[PDB]
């Protein structure tokens, strides 16, 4: 839901720039225990309301793993690297699902973001980080209704500065 990101440090906003046309994204998430979760998403703007259409294919999740056992904890915040390739944006991140027994089940996200505007109509962001904190606020009905929060920030590495003038 990439329209909801606070960009700092003057980083251009590929997602907000894409309106009114919108954008798509596509992703394969590889889990360290063999699962894969692939998705394609379309983002459009219907009057005052953003509209998402999502297609999902997940496979190879181990029967005994936290995912298929429905014994997962919570996601840690995640930091995505985002950069231009092939005139569109690539993203990759490592995410970590905290699970019982002091386990972290990690995964690797491989994403391409595709504006519906031509690249020549866009101010492309340089390499940067996108932090996303995802929290399940409530499981309203077991297996049936969830409330989920996300906070996201587009930024450079502020904590460790360059000696050469680099972002």
């Amino acid at each position: 839901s990439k329209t909801f990101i606070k960009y700092v440090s003057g980083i251009p906003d590929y997602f907000k720039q894409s309106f009114p046309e919108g954008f798509t994204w596509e992703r394969t998430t590889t889990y360290e225990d063999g699962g894969f979760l692939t998705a394609h998403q379309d983002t459009s703007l219907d009057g005052d309301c953003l509209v998402y259409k999502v297609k999902i294919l997940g496979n190879n999740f181990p029967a005994d793993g936290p995912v298929m056992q429905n014994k997962a904890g919570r996601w840690e915040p995640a930091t995505e690297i985002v950069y231009e390739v092939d005139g569109v944006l690539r993203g990759q991140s490592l995410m970590a699902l905290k699970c019982p027994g002091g386990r972290h089940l990690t995964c690797h996200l491989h994403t391409t973001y595709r504006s519906k505007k031509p690249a020549s109509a866009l101010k492309m962001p340089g390499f940067h980080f996108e932090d996303h904190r995802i929290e399940i606020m409530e499981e309203v009905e077991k297996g049936k209704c969830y409330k989920q929060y996300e906070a996201a920030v587009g930024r450079y590495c502020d904590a460790a500065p360059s000696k050469l003038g680099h972002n």
């Binding site: 909801f4 509209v51 999502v54 999740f61 606020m137 989920q148």
Partner: protein, 59 residues
């Protein structure tokens, strides 16, 4: 076209480990503050036989 508070709606269709499901969702956020919240409802294939967490980045 973008406002300081914006609603969104979602439809999700998926198969995970052979299990078909469909969801709808409705949310709202502040695009410039980078915050959002949504309610997701499983309308087919519920209760989900897997951790919702694998769908978090796709809502």
């Amino acid at each position: 076209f973008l406002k300081k508070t914006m609603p969104f709606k979602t439809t999700i269709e998926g198969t995970v480990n052979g299990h078909y499901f469909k969801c709808t969702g409705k949310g709202e956020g502040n695009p410039f503050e980078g915050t959002q919240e949504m309610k997701i409802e499983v309308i087919e294939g519920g209760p989900l036989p897997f951790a919702f967490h694998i769908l978090s980045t796709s809502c």
